[PDB]
Swiss-Prot record, chain A:
The lineage of its organism: Bacteria, Bacillati, Bacillota, Bacilli, Lactobacillales. Homodimer. It comes from the Bacteria. It comes from Streptococcus agalactiae serotype V (strain ATCC BAA-611 / 2603 V/R). Belongs to the WXG100 family. sagEsxA-like subfamily. This is ESAT-6-like protein SAG1039. Pfam families: WXG100.
Length: 96, 94
């Protein structure tokens, strides 16, 4: 099962995990910033010249949030798996 | 009609192109991490996360490109307006 199938150590899992959570935060930050810029552009540019970009942004936006949530979810799972493996190593060590 | 000056337009554009780049950076970086996990975790347990990531990836690419396209248009419009503002100033003064 998992103990056999997983080759990464708890430390290696945590190292990967950190990249996912940093990535998730960066994606969220870009989305929030540019969602604000879209509004600014909408309010200081009367008309409909910008309507097509607005709509593309709006359609993709929820997908970007899903991505960010996925990356954070991967972080959480990796961390929990690392903990479980680490405790396992500890228990097996004691047993002998 | 356009309340934003060319300088304000370029300031906004810079945020779009930096966002584009940053989003793509995260995608590329974690695409390699996905491969690390795939290679070092045998079996199908991580298959769902792999599928979800692979499914969203193309949208992340579309979004990054949308961001850059917006940047490029903002720059073009800023240039147009810059020339316009100069032409009008020169008209009135001259």
């Amino acid at each position: 099962g998992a103990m056999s199938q997983i080759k990464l150590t708890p430390e290696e899992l945590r190292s990967s995990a950190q990249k996912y959570t940093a990535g998730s935060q960066q994606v969220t930050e870009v989305l929030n910033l540019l969602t604000q810029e879209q509004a600014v552009i909408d309010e200081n540019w009367d008309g409909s010249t910008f309507d097509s970009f607005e709509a593309q942004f709006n359609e993709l936006s929820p997908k970007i949030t899903e991505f960010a949530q996925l990356l954070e979810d991967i972080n959480q799972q990796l961390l929990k798996v690392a903990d479980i493996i680490e405790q396992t190593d500890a228990d097996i060590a004691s047993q002998i």
